[PDB]
Design an enzyme around this catalytic site. Structure first.
Site, PDB file in Angstrom:
ATOM      1  N   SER A   1       0.869  -1.086  -0.026  1.00  0.00           N
ATOM      2  CA  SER A   1       0.143  -0.063   0.078  1.00  0.00           C
ATOM      3  C   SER A   1       0.708   1.208   0.127  1.00  0.00           C
ATOM      4  CB  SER A   1      -1.257  -0.073   1.211  1.00  0.00           C
ATOM      5  OG  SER A   1      -2.261  -0.637   0.676  1.00  0.00           O
TER       6      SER A   1
ATOM      7  N   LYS B   1       0.057   4.297  -2.679  1.00  0.00           N
ATOM      8  CA  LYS B   1      -0.944   4.719  -2.850  1.00  0.00           C
ATOM      9  C   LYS B   1      -0.598   6.342  -2.605  1.00  0.00           C
ATOM     10  CE  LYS B   1      -4.103   1.217  -1.304  1.00  0.00           C
ATOM     11  NZ  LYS B   1      -4.609   0.327  -0.096  1.00  0.00           N
TER      12      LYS B   1
ATOM     13  N   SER C   1      -5.775   3.430   4.023  1.00  0.00           N
ATOM     14  CA  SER C   1      -5.346   2.273   3.142  1.00  0.00           C
ATOM     15  C   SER C   1      -6.604   1.657   2.165  1.00  0.00           C
ATOM     16  CB  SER C   1      -4.616   1.319   3.827  1.00  0.00           C
ATOM     17  OG  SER C   1      -3.461   0.848   2.947  1.00  0.00           O
TER      18      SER C   1
ATOM     19  N   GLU D   1      -5.697  -3.410  -6.616  1.00  0.00           N
ATOM     20  CA  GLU D   1      -5.986  -4.095  -5.400  1.00  0.00           C
ATOM     21  C   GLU D   1      -7.125  -4.962  -5.457  1.00  0.00           C
ATOM     22  OE1 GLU D   1      -4.393  -3.968  -2.793  1.00  0.00           O
ATOM     23  OE2 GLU D   1      -3.316  -1.831  -2.627  1.00  0.00           O
TER      24      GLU D   1
ATOM     25  N   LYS E   1       2.917   6.439   5.225  1.00  0.00           N
ATOM     26  CA  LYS E   1       2.157   5.513   4.605  1.00  0.00           C
ATOM     27  C   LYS E   1       2.644   4.219   4.921  1.00  0.00           C
ATOM     28  CE  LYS E   1      -1.529   3.747   2.622  1.00  0.00           C
ATOM     29  NZ  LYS E   1      -1.447   2.630   3.750  1.00  0.00           N
ATOM     30  N   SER E   2       1.757   3.294   5.284  1.00  0.00           N
ATOM     31  CA  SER E   2       2.271   1.681   5.792  1.00  0.00           C
ATOM     32  C   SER E   2       1.742   0.941   4.479  1.00  0.00           C
ATOM     33  CB  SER E   2       2.235   1.295   6.674  1.00  0.00           C
ATOM     34  OG  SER E   2       0.591   1.386   7.289  1.00  0.00           O
ATOM     35  N   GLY E   3       2.273  -0.123   4.522  1.00  0.00           N
ATOM     36  CA  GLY E   3       1.875  -1.514   3.597  1.00  0.00           C
ATOM     37  C   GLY E   3       2.199  -2.736   4.423  1.00  0.00           C
ATOM     38  N   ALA E   4       1.346  -3.683   3.958  1.00  0.00           N
ATOM     39  CA  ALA E   4       1.487  -5.038   4.555  1.00  0.00           C
ATOM     40  C   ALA E   4       0.974  -6.087   3.451  1.00  0.00           C
ATOM     41  CB  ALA E   4       0.605  -5.204   5.780  1.00  0.00           C
TER      42      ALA E   4
END
Ligand SMILES: [Ca+2]
Length: 263
Positions: free
Chosen positions: A45, A48, A105, A141, A209-212
């Site tokens: 993510s 984004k 997200s 996504e 901003k994070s992602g997983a």
């Protein structure tokens, strides 16, 4: 508190897979320290932010309006759409969609925004067209995050991402208003609490901003600094392991504690 590079390497020892890290000086763009800077990692993510940079760039070009309202339907909804699923009747504006994509997200928001620009290939084109010949988006996504099995699809490197993020947040590739808008969205992130935020002292500024992925991967991009003002860019990526989410999160938080304590 271990030195940050020591801690990054220790994280990788404990997690398996790879951990990538870079810290840039925001004003100058100089690399302050790094680990695996030129290796590829899945963005998850974190893409984004880049997507909303492309949207803002269209706003600045007179090709898009943040207040333009997009109606959509139930069939557009994909996994992890906590904001968009609540606006089937009213739709959302382009600016609302960026807020949802970045701050929550939201995956359907990201897809809608990708449509505005013509799809993942067009985001890659945007990046190329700003001088990032590394970063690539290939998927929509939810295929993009919740697991990118490690192809070069949907990847960046720590240095490419850091560099690109700095070019969106500073300089003149976006107007002053759009640069501010992008950082505002990132400052308003609501879903990255367990990460760098967990280590952040009172009074600091962070925009992130994070992602997983379910398995294997995690990441965060951030602009942060003391006294209300960001002064460095930090990018951390993790992939290729079998570590739990709590373990991935803890290692990011511990890397963050090191970089704050050694600031
Ligand atoms: Ca190693």
């Amino acid at each position: 508190h271990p030195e940050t590079l020591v801690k990054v390497k220790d994280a990788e020892d404990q997690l398996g897979g790879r951990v990538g890290y870079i810290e840039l000086d925001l004003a100058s763009g100089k690399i302050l320290e790094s680990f695996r800077p030129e290796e590829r990692f899945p963005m998850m993510s974190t893409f984004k932010v880049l997507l909303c940079g492309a949207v803002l760039s269209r706003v600045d070009a007179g090709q898009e309006q943040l207040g333009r309202r997009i109606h959509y339907s139930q069939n557009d909804l994909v996994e992890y759409s906590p904001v968009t699923e609540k606006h089937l009747t009213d739709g959302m504006t382009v600016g609302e969609l960026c807020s949802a994509a970045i701050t929550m997200s939201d995956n359907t928001a990201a897809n809608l925004l990708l449509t505005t620009i013509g799809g993942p290939k067009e985001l890659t084109a945007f990046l190329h067209n700003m001088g990032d010949h590394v970063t690539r988006l290939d998927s929509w996504e939810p295929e993009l995050n919740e697991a990118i099995p490690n192809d070069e699809r949907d990847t960046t490197t720590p240095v490419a991402m850091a560099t690109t993020l700095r070019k969106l947040l500073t300089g003149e590739l976006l107007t002053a208003a759009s640069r501010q808008q992008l950082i505002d969205w990132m400052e308003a992130d609501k879903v990255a609490g367990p990460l760098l935020r967990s280590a952040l002292p009172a009074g600091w500024f962070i925009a992130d901003k994070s992602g997983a992925s379910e398995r294997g991967s995690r990441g965060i991009i951030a602009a942060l600094g003391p006294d209300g003002k960001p002064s460095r860019i930090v990018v951390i990526y993790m992939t290729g392991s079998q570590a739990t989410m709590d373990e991935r999160n803890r290692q990011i938080a511990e890397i963050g504690a090191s970089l704050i304590k050694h600031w």
